[PDB]
């Protein structure tokens, strides 16, 4: 049949003056482009076939060739930027948007998929898909009373394509396009399918990856409680983007951070900060670092939820990248915390693991740690307890480590170390 054609046979059929021969050849091309390994995308492009495929998208009378050509072009567009560009340069964008209204669901779905690949290439093609008017017809496909009536695979493809329209920066998507998509996104975030939920969270994570005004557009829709709920999901593909979005939101204002706290997020972090997946631990500690950078009453919520011992834990043992985020979390905590809060930190065991990290060959974490020590002494001076702290650091080998850092090449390191030695270790 159409299994395993040569490119030149495909060309021969598509150049015939016979719509059925063209359909046969287009299907043969689709099967080449769908094969497991090394689909001959460039050979198909070089054969000049994209304009033919694009013209087949418009053949309302032959729905099968619309489908086969849509599938073929989707798989060309799934490749490199240059391959996606070839599809765009053939006029595919407006042709696919017209197919979103097709009465055949499998064709409309394929057009959704193709536009997701095109938009997923980057900012420019994303905004070009939007300028051609794709959002209106895409959202119209989801204007049903109950999303459960839609085919599962259909809804997943729609959610995935919408998330690509939210993706990428420099520039971020147009504000008006974000406002247009967000209400449907909030609704998908409440759908029961794990894959729809994962991609809805990715979309929100993209939209919160920016300045505070972008975060505000999302938080104002009231999605933070649902994000915290998904933060506790058992599916890692859901937790990962949900945590990224929460982490993005707490890089905003302290008022935006407070919405996350109010929603109950901190109760999830005992398991997140011990999660077996190192990337979850890292991003959970990163999130914590931008909560300890907030107000003293927000630091106090971290204390109340029992999370300071968990920060001691990750500082003591974790992937180094996670340990570096934990160091940041401690420096922010000691920078903004009360004296009582900093005292509590020391009583939880922070000093020893903090000192042990001074032998790391990363000059940035050393700066961060030395700042934290300085902040802790400042809290101790206020209590007249410098010596006790000085002794505690000595007993665990910290003084040896700080003494050597006077010999460090980095200027900040050897200034801060010498400053510490002079003031507190005499």
């Amino acid at each position: 049949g159409t299994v395993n054609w040569s490119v030149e046979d495909i060309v021969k059929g598509i150049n015939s003056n016979n719509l059925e021969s063209q359909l046969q050849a287009t299907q043969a091309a689709r099967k080449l482009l769908s094969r497991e390994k090394q689909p001959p995308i460039d050979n198909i492009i070089r054969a000049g076939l994209i304009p033919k495929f694009v013209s087949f998208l418009g053949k309302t009378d032959c729905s099968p060739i619309q489908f086969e050509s849509a599938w073929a072009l989707t798989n060309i567009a799934s490749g490199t930027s240059e391959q996606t560009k070839a599809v765009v340069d053939g006029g595919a964008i407006p042709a696919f948007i017209s197919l979103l209204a097709s009465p055949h669901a499998h064709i409309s779905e394929q057009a959704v998929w193709a536009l997701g690949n095109i938009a997923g290439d980057g900012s420019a093609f994303r905004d070009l898909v939007i300028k051609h008017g794709a959002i209106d017809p895409l959202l119209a496909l989801l204007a049903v009373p109950d999303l459960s009536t839609l085919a599962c695979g259909y809804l997943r493809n729609l959610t995935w394509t919408l998330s690509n329209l939210c993706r990428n920066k420099n520039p971020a998507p147009p504000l008006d396009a974000v406002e247009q998509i967000l209400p449907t996104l909030v609704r998908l975030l409440h759908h029961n399918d794990p894959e729809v939920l994962a991609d809805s969270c990715w979309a929100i994570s993209y939209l919160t990856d920016g300045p505070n005004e972008r975060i505000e557009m999302v938080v104002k829709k009231g999605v933070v409680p649902q994000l915290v709920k998904l933060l506790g999901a058992t599916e890692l593909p859901i937790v990962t983007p949900a945590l990224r979005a929460i982490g993005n939101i707490v890089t905003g204002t302290d008022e935006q951070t407070q919405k996350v706290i109010d929603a109950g997020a901190l109760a999830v972090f005992p398991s997140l900060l011990t999660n077996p997946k190192t990337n979850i631990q890292k991003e959970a500690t990163w999130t914590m670092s931008n909560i300890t950078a907030g107000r003293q009453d927000q630091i106090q919520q971290v204390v109340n939820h029992g999370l300071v011992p968990f920060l001691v834990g990750v500082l003591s043992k974790a992937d180094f990248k996670t340990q570096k985020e934990a160091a940041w979390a401690i420096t922010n905590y000691t920078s903004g915390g009360t004296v009582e809060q900093i005292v509590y930190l020391v009583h939880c065991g922070i000093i020893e693991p903090l000192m042990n990290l001074l032998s790391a060959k990363d000059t940035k974490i050393i700066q961060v740690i030395l700042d934290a020590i300085s902040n802790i002494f400042q809290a101790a001076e206020k209590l007249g307890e410098t010596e006790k702290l000085s002794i505690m650091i000595e007993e665990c080998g910290g003084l040896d480590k700080i003494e050597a850092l006077q010999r460090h090449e980095n200027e900040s390191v050897y200034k801060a170390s010498l400053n510490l030695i002079e003031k507190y270790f005499s």
Binding site: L33, S34, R35, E36, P39, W71, T74, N75, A77, S78, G79, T84, Q110, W113, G116, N117, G120, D121, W160, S163, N164, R167, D199, W202
Partner: peptide
């Protein structure tokens, strides 16, 4: 995500 190729 980013891009997806359809295989079946």
């Amino acid at each position: 995500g980013r891009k997806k190729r359809r295989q079946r």
